[PDB]
Amino acid sequence: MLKIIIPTTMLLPMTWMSKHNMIWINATVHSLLISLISLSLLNQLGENSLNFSLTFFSDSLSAPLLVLTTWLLPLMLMASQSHLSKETTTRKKLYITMLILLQLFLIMTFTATELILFYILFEATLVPTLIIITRWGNQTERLNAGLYFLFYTLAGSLPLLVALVYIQNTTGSLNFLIIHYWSHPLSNSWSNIFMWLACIMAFMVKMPLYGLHLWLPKAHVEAPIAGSMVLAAVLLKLGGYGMMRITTILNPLTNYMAYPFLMLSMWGMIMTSSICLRQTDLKSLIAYSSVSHMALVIVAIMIQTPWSFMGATALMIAHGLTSSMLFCLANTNYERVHSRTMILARGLQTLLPLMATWWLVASLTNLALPPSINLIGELFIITASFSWSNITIILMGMNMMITALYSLYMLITTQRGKYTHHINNIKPSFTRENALMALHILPLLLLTLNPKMILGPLY
Amino acid sequence: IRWTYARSANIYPNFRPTPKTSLLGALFGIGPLFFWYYVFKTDRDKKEKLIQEGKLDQTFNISY
Amino acid sequence: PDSWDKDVYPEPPRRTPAPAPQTSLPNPVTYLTKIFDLLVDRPVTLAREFIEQQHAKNRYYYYHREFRRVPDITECEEKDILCMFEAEMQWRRDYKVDQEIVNIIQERLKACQQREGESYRQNCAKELEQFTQVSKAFQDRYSDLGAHYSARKCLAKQKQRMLAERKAAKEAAAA
Amino acid sequence: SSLLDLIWLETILPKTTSFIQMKMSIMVSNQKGLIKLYFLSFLITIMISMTLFN
Amino acid sequence: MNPFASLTLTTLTILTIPIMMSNSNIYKTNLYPNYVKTTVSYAFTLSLVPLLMFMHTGQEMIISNWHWMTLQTVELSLSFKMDYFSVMFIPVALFVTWSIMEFSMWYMHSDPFINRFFKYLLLFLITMMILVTANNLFQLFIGWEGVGIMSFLLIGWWHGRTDANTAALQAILYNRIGDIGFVLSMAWFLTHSNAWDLQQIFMLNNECPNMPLIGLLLAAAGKSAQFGLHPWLPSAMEGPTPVSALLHSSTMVVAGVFLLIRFYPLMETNKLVQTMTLCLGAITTLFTALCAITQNDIKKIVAFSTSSQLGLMMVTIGINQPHLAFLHI
Amino acid sequence: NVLQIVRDHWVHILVPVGFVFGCYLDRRSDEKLTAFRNKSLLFKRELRPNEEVTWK
Amino acid sequence: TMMSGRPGRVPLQFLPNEARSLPPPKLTDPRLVYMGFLGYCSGLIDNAIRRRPVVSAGLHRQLLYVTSFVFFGYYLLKRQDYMYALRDHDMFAYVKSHPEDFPEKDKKTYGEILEEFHPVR
Amino acid sequence: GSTFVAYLPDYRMQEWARREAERLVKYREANGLPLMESNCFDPNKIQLPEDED
Amino acid sequence: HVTKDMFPGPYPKTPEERAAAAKKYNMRVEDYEPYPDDGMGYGDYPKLPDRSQQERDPWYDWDHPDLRLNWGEPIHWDLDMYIRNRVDTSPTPVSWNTMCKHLF
């Protein structure tokens, strides 16, 4: 695994020893090459895992997340090139350093054979994101947003640490392989109930769970474009990955303890999809859509059936790509209009036709149009839920209908109708933005050809 | 901007705990959760019982 | 074709009727399929002959991997991690092979349904019975392990099932 | 959008925590700097400590 | 070698070549609509061959050509069903689309984006053929959603008009209401029959229960504009007249009926679902004819006529006469 | 020009070097996990006449 | 494990004589490399605080930082390894001398252990 | 990278499992064995606890 | 370019701050009417008539012809509910209760 970690570390001295006007080119080229190298982790086994060493191991759940993490950095650099133009070389190098450190921590987090090492890196990712949000955000609310994004996380994560060390004091190890092979049932006890809660709540808060989702709209709205991209694409999936790893020690207590979270997610997906219908801000609408999709992923993980896990993996990958694309489109509009109010700039199809095509395809993938991987994950989760209980179909279908409604509402409001007359600074789309949009969308339509790459270890 | 600010950021500083507000919040934020919990719990208890007596006819039910 | 075993994937002897033209009017199907043959099948056949000779010039082989049998999870001590690893890998391989067996039987059933046409309900009882038996066995083995399945959970399920069977048999004997 | 997400979910977890910590901080850090009150509390704590433990 | 499969696949394949050339130079010229029309006419005259072969013999195939993902004991493959319904409906759809495109070459001559309009029409035709020939439920769902998206794009052709966008969103809403039942049926069939392929569904369901058939009926009611979900079809007359003539008149709107024709072996084993279908068709045809007899927009009158004929089709389905409903289609 | 563009493009070589160093370190860490090489019940194999180790 | 009162412990020895029976850490030890990296970081920060070219201001000073960090890290690693070796030695001796407090578990195979099965439905 | 992913070798052993199942089904059909067995492990090598209730 | 005094504020109690709020929203004091002072966070925002945008005059030369809105005029709290793409409240030839009875 060092053949990916070491180049990502070398990205830092290369960035800091670069010319003042070569940082973006060098960073983009070498991050793309690192993505290409990481692409060879996809050759997974039907047996246990790719156990590289005592410290790092790869799995067909970890490999798609690793590849998406490596692929996201070049897109983040391309998106950040525009709004950082008027800023000094040292500060741009610091921004690229924060992005590189975030990638390094995420890469080490997804392999992380140890649960304490996983926790340490899973919490180390917090610092670069907070600095990016509270340093290079625009509005005055960013500081407040950062505070939320901080404390919520720690409010969930501090009990987990205690639980973790407690387990190693009883089991003797926190290695995931030993934990899986030596797993034992949890008796229905108050102590075991609180151990279950301490294990679950940390990952629940970062999905986020419906009741615990307040930090996400603030953090995603006030963050710069690279921050929003990394928050929606990779950082939300840490909770799902952690739950998928940790639910192996929580059986059979998950059967009883899953009910409040299942109800919260099943009702909150409807609530947040309905919230999307009445939203005056593009970024907030995209954030609430992310909350709905992650609610579906929470349901899938809580059901803990093979089809549930496959659907959850597919949906995590598809949502990451789609939400990053949607945020990039919103930012392309914002850098022209500087308002971030959906109703202000209207009828952009007549002025930006190719960008309108990008908007249409992004809305189509968000709408879960078959045979996209978005719908593959959606349908697998829905079928698993139907087997779990036939009444889930009402909530699932209502969520599908509202999702289509708000996706097409977002498309029609911004692209169709009549152009706003007083806005005359809508310049033609740059090659950088179109390239960014294509680099988001072609991986999705190309992954629909080989779904088993993103269906997880239970395929 | 006044419209968007009133819709988003002017809400909480103008909020007061009121019988109308408290009852509406409790109802619309708790009642659906407990209603759905009752519905799903009853359905799953019925399913579990029927499996216990074996009168469910789970033939060809392979994928779950 | 020799590319697959006829016994694993059986087919009926494929009886076909002989043309019995009761009128002298030329049916367009015969002439049209002859011109299709001339304009399509021969060039494709010749291209295949070219490709097959080129393949025959360079002949090399690949092998199907053989896996030895190892002790299963029952012959493993309660904390002996190495034997548990061996048994778990063997059990996962067996699970995959069982899935493929069910796939083969389902393919048989689908082919029967399409082939027998309007009388599939009677002329596919054999495949339905085979699929029912295989489905029942597969369900008894792997129905409810859920995600995070293992050989230990399958063994516990089997032990519970056969304890229930022993209790039922003892109740029948002492009835 | 308003009753639950913008009002009550804020009121329950974050706003309540902020209010409680605010009030506790105000109570804790508001001493006038008079060592008379400090050493009176010292006597109180010392007296309480000896009696409760043994 | 038995050209039935090769020709029945060559039809659908050559239908897709102008979509490939949509980035070439011909798409930037004024010869693109004639190119698309000629391709469709060639597809029709080539699809006339499997029709003759079936009419002579009754020849039937399943062509499972590409194996897509396999899900433990469930195998998903690109499979085409080439039964009587497919080989009979494909030439009719191709003939109607050929006439529609020749008509559009005159009706939409002044439209600046006519190449795009022709391209959209071909995409709808491709999705409809995908829907018609699908052998499993996932492929048929692909076609189901593709025709709906093409309908949304073609209804809101004039995107500066508010009413066109409203009508397009209305169609999407009603079709999602039907999609709920579609997804319900798919989940039920996977959970109980362990398959989405039609052969296993027919083999394992001798007496089909209520949920899958009710989901199928809800999907059909959504897509064929039955009484509960009817208004979107008259609202869809906002699009250009060729779009109304091809999609919302004769080809797309019959798709729901087609679905109930595709699952007729399971419908005949259920008695309550037949009654529901019959009553829904009767109320739909009556209500829509009653609305039609008093309208002043000619396109609205013809749309209500289409809705009444669809209601009659599902009445025929409800009296357990599926082949007669197909002939009426 | 040599000795001139090196002073301007020296940074580019670092990422590729890291990839090679990581591969070398991965192999070196592999060399410390040979306690069961040619000893598993599944792959107990008798060495070829001109073979030292089954895998490296 | 409080080892302050462990018998035969000379008060202020960093490394006792018996520690010489343990293998010394290699000079290419990853922990030593991290110590050198920490020294290099200290040198860079010292350059930055003094408003000097961070990478190439004082090569002698940066070399001294790296060398001192590596030196102390080597001795610290030796002491750490010695203390862990003592912990293991004492643990094993105590287990050996008290067999009644560490009885051998009877090796039992999973074939005759009854684990309760919980279906996932 | 897409071409590399397309041509990745079968380390998941899909064709291997298919061939194993093919020969196993051929063997059991020839010998009249009841295809898949309902027991995953042999019952002779499991020691149940005697109840004596 | 908006200052702090031009943003929505708390519910006005005295007629002086009522006049200030009416002046802020570019509308007459006699026409200004805030939402009732309940627990909802309406605060200081005009309660415009619940009429939809569809029934606004289509022959007027609006600055936003599609939305039928002017530049500085106060925006209804539920504008995105009434956008001619959504629910409209236009008078119908038949009364709502009569239609409901007939349909039912």
Ligand SMILES: CCCCCCCCCCCCCCCCCC(=O)OC[C@H](COP(=O)([O-])OCC(O)COP(=O)([O-])OC[C@@H](COC(=O)CCCCCCCCCCCCCCCCC)OC(=O)CCCCCCCCCCCCCCCCC)OC(=O)CCCCCCCCCCCCCCCCC
């Ligand atoms: C995970 C482990 C792996 C990664 C390790 C990460 C840490 C490693 C380094 C640790 C510390 C060492 C350096 C710190 C000294 C500060 C230097 C500095 O200020 O930068 C200027 C300096 C360039 O500027 P200059 O023209 O020389 O002088 C102008 C002034 O110095 C500066 O101009 P100015 O002062 O006028 O500009 C003002 C600016 C200047 O203020 C600063 O930028 C100060 C730097 C931050 C302080 C760092 C604190 C201590 C480090 C702890 C990091 C915690 C990491 C844990 C994760 C949480 C992330 C926070 O301040 C601001 O703008 C304030 C607002 C910024 C936003 C808030 C600040 C965020 C702080 C977070 C930074 C964390 C990453 C830093 C990366 C290194 C930065 C150079 O940067 C450098 O050149 C040094 C970079 C390292 C040199 C590498 C040489 C090796 C390359 C060739 C050999 C290849 C090796 C491989 C062998 C194989 C080859 C064949």
Ligand SMILES: CCCCCCCCCCCCCCCCC[C@@H](O)O[C@H](CO[C@H](O)CCCCCCCCCCCCCCC)COP(=O)(O)OCC[N+](C)(C)C
């Ligand atoms: C502009 C108008 C159109 C012009 C162009 C016309 C031509 C269109 C044709 C292309 C689209 C039509 C679809 C037809 C597909 C043909 C190719 C396909 O069949 O190959 C696929 C093969 O492709 C791969 O399966 C999919 C590509 C994998 C995508 C990887 C992403 C690239 C990395 C980017 C970074 C990652 C970002 C996202 C993180 C998760 C599936 O093959 P498969 O049967 O299976 O096995 C391969 C061959 N074997 C048998 C030897 C093994």
Ligand SMILES: CCCCCCCCCCCCCCCCC[C@@H](O)O[C@H](CO[C@H](O)CCCCCCCCCCCCCCC)COP(=O)(O)OCC[N+](C)(C)C
């Ligand atoms: C706010 C946004 C979302 C945040 C996250 C929300 C999710 C947290 C929900 C916690 C999951 C369940 C917690 C406890 C479940 C135990 C089962 C219980 O509910 O049922 C009865 C439990 O009875 C009563 O509940 C006893 C406890 C009564 C006191 C609980 C307070 C009630 C409301 C508190 C909710 C506040 C949550 C937030 C706290 C800050 C059954 O009684 P009994 O069969 O005999 O005992 C079963 C337990 N045994 C077997 C271990 C002994």
Ligand SMILES: CCCCCCCC/C=C\CCCCCCCC(=O)O[C@H](COC(=O)CCCCCCC/C=C/CCCCCCCC)COP(=O)(O)OCCN
């Ligand atoms: C987003 C903000 C959420 C804030 C955190 C939410 C998670 C809360 C989970 C509990 C926190 C601490 C739990 C302890 C960690 C696990 C350790 C464990 O399981 O050991 C238990 C110990 O169990 C406990 O001590 C639990 C005491 C909990 C005290 C703190 C209560 C915090 C609030 C309680 C009400 C809310 C609970 C769920 C909240 C969910 C989040 C909203 C048994 O060990 P022994 O006692 O040694 O063995 C038994 C024989 N003696």
